[PDB]
Design a protein around this ligand. Structure first.
Ligand SMILES: Nc1ncnc2c1ncn2[C@@H]1O[C@H](COP(=O)(O)OP(=O)(O)O)[C@@H](O)[C@H]1O
Ligand SMILES: Nc1ncnc2c1ncn2[C@@H]1O[C@H](COP(=O)(O)OP(=O)(O)O)[C@@H](O)[C@H]1O
Ligand SMILES: Nc1ncnc2c1ncn2[C@@H]1O[C@H](COP(=O)(O)OP(=O)(O)O)[C@@H](O)[C@H]1O
Ligand SMILES: [Mg+2]
Ligand SMILES: [Mg+2]
Ligand SMILES: [Mg+2]
Lengths: 359, 138, 359, 359, 138
């Protein structure tokens, strides 16, 4: 029926409304020789002799010329549908300047000739899918992370923060500390191998100091199978990699607060009478929050900072990996939603200002 | 291609129709005069991969472009693949001509996953499923 | 029609395009007194009182002055055709320096006045004739042997190896171990006799240790007829000679890896994700691979080195003796190939650099 | 007096404090039959029938069982001194895990009964011997290379890089490209000959493209004398071999940055206000930096990457080959240094943790 | 310091006098026995920086504590700096000994701006003026 697209920062999620999960996931990269250009997995395969740039990094569009190729690849190569025969729903990052929103709708109407367009908010869609209206949303992607407090369906613009430290830096830190056991992973072919190890074996340790001391005595390691057929052994790096999130000083970021401090500092920027309600509605989102035992550790850390009269609660839905896309897919499948789209004729008679008033 | 063959004008149009889910597969072979690659057979979306596997002939190599679905854990995922079928029992002249002419399809088969098969064991579904998943990050 | 020439290292193959097998085979040697010079079989007949040198040994041209006599002998004495009225196709060894290629085309255009010239790659032509595009080619000549992995029609320059141990050394080893049964073969007249024994009676034994012990108990020998009419008996030397290929330490080459190790070390120099495809496309070539039961033994040896998750496959076409020449002959017979030749006028207006861009 | 040992990666330097140069240099290899084991030059002489392994490669200890034989060989066979009557000073590679340091001091106290022990840092000792306190040290060994920025006597752990491409790979590349002029160097006897050619004739060309074109016109070659008495001619391979350092893509390492890029990327990982001081204090070290005209070429390459407001300076002391050992030798000869050693009694009453607090 | 040298008792007193504008500069060098750092020369406030720049010797490293004034746009501003002068032409033993002994002065030179110079181009006034202004917020 309709098309739901989640640009993200590292990977692009696309599909059709009504599905329970996206069917097309591919990184958002553009490659050029060291075919004039390569987009998506095409540049990934030839990554050795190509220079890669990110049209969208840290959640904000940096180059519109290279961003249009991402959308063109999705419609024709990936979705294989005509852009002028379907309704497209897009999402934007928090604190997005209005100039980007005006240019985003201009491209769809003028270049792809999209008949109906609608732009949503990532934080709002993620919160509604959890059956809540007031709360604080902790989004952990790969190139950026956000904390967006939402009260009665409206976000608070003066309590939004960015750290620009997420799962992408975890892969590099894991790759660097893997050289202690010999070998190397400089080439991009082995970079993808390191990512698979992070998503299958790494887990969050409840007590960091206790695990480090007792790991040496046990000297336990696990086996991982390389594509060539060789078997690689992974030791204590499983629980050392996710610890960067709680204490970002291990990667040279002394000023970065980390997850427990980011939530605490964002709540205190709000009204005094609303802080108590926000503490009890902490909602996790993003792919970087899928580490094992993460919600249990996060609740303990925040409780120490909070006063003794506040008991924080952490909500971690199982489907938090694709909360933004799932929420948008469900909303577009509603029968009554047909009156919420922005028609192309309205844009012609009103200009780019129509999106600001609607949506 | 080093052999010097080219593509028929109808070949490019047939590939676009396959991309837009207007057909299931398109089979291409070298012409009788041996100067161009021409479309031979086009199948409708009703047919599946298993029926096409029985259409391969041990005496005649061919190029097959197929839209393969593997049903990854309840997901109706589909992948575009390009099968190069050159049996070892073919004539020495035919094997040389088809192998050197593979480069011609590279200009029009962008996005298709190249798969090489020389025997019936290489046409197994598990073999194809393993290869398509290797190049997908997700 | 056209002329297809395969210089090789020990013997020269020449003929006309469209044939199923070369018609002219003669060794590439130059003789001078201990006629000022003798080339080919002319020097072979008078080998007793002549000093022999190899213009091309180990696959790379060493002396262009003596190499021109080889081509002059082929055109006039052997082929008996005018070089200025036919198209000539040549082949070059892997890892050939561009200086040799530039000098090779200079001689044809300026000395022999060849109208059209084309230079191919021996590894590529051998692989295409087997109905494949990706694989690893094991070429075993007489003065040199190569392992060239090819991926999507392009060879990998960083995984090519040479051993410089092939069928030529097998003849000398067989001749030396034949003195145990008396007599001698010092003179060059009996050297050719030893070569005929190698190509008719020698075979590869599946189990080397088992055959050696049981051969003494059986004491079986076979009869070979000398040109003089006398009958010579050959014992266990039939299967001892080819064993040098698998274990080259018998001839004082301790550092040489041998056939099973040469393939294994060449594959591991490539990308990790491509190694699995190369293991299943091992293609044999060269005259030294014509020994009986060789492919069966080679597959077993490689399987031991490979991990348990890899199942190598060995392909041995019956016509592997002249794969390079047959592939070139078929290609030149194509009707559409007429646009691939390099005309002499192009060389005049561009210089020697034309061959690098074309072909 | 005292003993100063520099393990290195390919060769071991040992001697007595107060000397101006080490007296004992031998490769760090362990040989076993294809004497139960052979260590050092003993395995080198019988290299034909022995399998060689490196206890320390890429700068990090891989096998402690085979590493103890290296130290045992040095004390008894090489130095010919009692380990329990002298003070030993050791050095460790940058980013060395504390587990290796704890095991290193355990062996000396418990096995060799060393009375006093001290462990230094290779980067710090090399920088101090140049009369500097802040700068960036470029160390080029044979099995590994490092870039360690040092500020006010303390290194920055988050700007250290490894390439694992150094002079050892240069010998193999030179050996491979030497086959173009005929002959071969497969055996280990001729491998040592190739190394001597690298250290006597090879030099860095200021303009790579200009030299390649004009070398063919000149066709100049130089003579080298083999141990057998024969004379070998070396052509343009003299300046082609060191070019791998600047562009490591010639050996299949596309992802490797090379020397000019390694320094640039390491500086930018530091604080913004400190980068300007680091650009003017680039210090060369290691045996692989002894090529002629190398410092002049390196300064030009870095200047292109640096902005127009930065003027980098390169410092190349004449004694940079043994900077680590010379610096350690001078420090141990000081009269006031006697209070810096770690006594064996302290280890007994405190355990392995004493080395972390001291040194 | 890792070398193990210490400071003479008179060194601490001389630094305090320099702070209270009782002298212009104090030069410190390692003793003859090479065990302690001792004061060598003290200059009066009449002398300026230009005269002291000519007192540096290319064969002898030394530590110089100076009260530097740069006259920032008609302002008689002064800044306390500590110059580490180790020429590249010095003996290898001298360069190692002085470099490793720099940490000893850290306990008494609080507030002094450390400046490292290894050649005459690093002693330029413009070089010093640029560095002192970098660390000042005003
Ligand atoms: N199971 C998992 N465990 C840990 N990290 C994961 C897992 N799956 C994905 N990731 C990480 O999440 C990142 C992207 O997640 P997501 O937030 O969905 O996309 P984006 O960051 O573009 O919004 C990837 O870089 C990946 O490393
Ligand atoms: N039937 C055979 N069995 C074993 N060896 C053979 C046979 N025929 C030829 N040879 C060997 O092959 C060598 C040359 O083969 P080939 O590779 O075709 O030429 P080149 O080595 O010049 O490329 C000869 O030295 C010969 O000893
Ligand atoms: N004069 C020279 N020119 C070029 N390279 C050299 C020279 N002398 C030694 N080398 C190379 O330096 C390497 C080892 O140097 P060094 O760094 O001192 O030891 P390590 O690499 O073990 O630290 C050797 O592999 C050798 O090839
Ligand atoms: Mg997201
Ligand atoms: Mg050949
Ligand atoms: Mg070293």
């Amino acid at each position: 029926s309709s098309i739901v697209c989640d640009n993200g920062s590292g990977m692009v999620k696309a599909g059709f409304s009504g599905d329970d999960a996206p069917r097309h996931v591919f990184p958002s990269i553009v490659g050029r020789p060291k075919k004039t250009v390569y987009v998506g997995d095409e540049a990934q395969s030839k990554r050795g002799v190509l220079s890669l740039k990110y049209p969208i990094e840290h959640g904000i569009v940096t180059n519109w010329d290279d961003m249009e190729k991402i959308w063109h690849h999705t419609f024709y190569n990936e979705l294989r549908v005509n852009p002028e025969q379907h309704n497209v729903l897009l999402t934007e990052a928090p604190m997005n300047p209005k100039q980007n929103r005006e240019k985003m709708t201009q491209i769809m109407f003028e270049t792809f000739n999209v008949p109906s367009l609608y732009i949503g908010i990532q934080a709002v869609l993620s919160l509604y899918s959890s059956g809540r209206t007031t709360g604080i949303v902790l989004d952990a992607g790969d190139g950026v992370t956000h904390t967006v407090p939402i009260y009665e369906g409206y976000s608070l613009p003066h309590a939004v923060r960015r750290v620009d430290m997420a799962g992408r830096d975890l892969t590099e830190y894991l790759m660097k500390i893997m050289m202690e056991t010999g070998t190397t992973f400089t080439t991009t072919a082995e970079k993808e191998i390191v990512r698979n190890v992070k998503e299958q074996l790494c887990y969050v340790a409840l007590d960091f100091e206790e695990e480090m001391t007792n790991s040496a005595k046990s000297a336990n390691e696990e086996a991982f199978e390389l594509p060539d057929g060789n078997v690689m052994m992974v030791g204590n790096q499983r629980f050392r990699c996710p610890e960067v999130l709680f204490k970002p000083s291990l990667i040279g970021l002394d000023e970065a607060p980390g997850f427990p401090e980011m939530v605490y500092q964002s709540i205190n920027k709000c009204d005094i009478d609303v802080r108590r309600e926000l503490y009890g509605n902490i909602v996790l989102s993003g792919g970087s929050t899928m580490f094992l035992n993460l919600p249990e550790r996060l609740a303990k850390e925040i409780s120490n900072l909070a006063p003794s009269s506040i008991k924080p609660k952490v909500v971690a839905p199982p489907e938090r990996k694709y909360s933004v896309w799932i929420g948008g897919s469900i909303l577009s499948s509603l029968t009554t939603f047909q009156t919420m789209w922005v028609k192309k004729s309205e844009y012609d008679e009103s200009g780019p200002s129509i999106v600001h008033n609607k949506c | 291609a080093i052999s010097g063959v080219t593509l028929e004008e109808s070949v490019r149009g047939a590939i676009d129709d396959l991309r837009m889910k207007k057909s299931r597969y398109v089979m291409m072979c070298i012409g009788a005069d041996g100067k161009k690659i021409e479309v031979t057979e086009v199948g409708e979306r009703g047919v599946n991969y298993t029926d096409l596997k029985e259409k391969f002939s041990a005496e005649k190599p061919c190029y097959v472009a197929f839209d393969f679905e593997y049903n990854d854990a309840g997901s109706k995922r589909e992948k575009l693949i390009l099968i190069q079928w050159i049996p070892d029992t073919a004539r020495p002249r035919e094997k040389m001509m088809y192998s050197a002419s593979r480069d011609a399809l590279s200009s029009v088969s962008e996005g298709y996953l190249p798969i090489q098969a020389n025997d019936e064991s290489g046409l197994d579904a598990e073999e194809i499923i393993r290869k398509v998943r290797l190049h997908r990050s997700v």
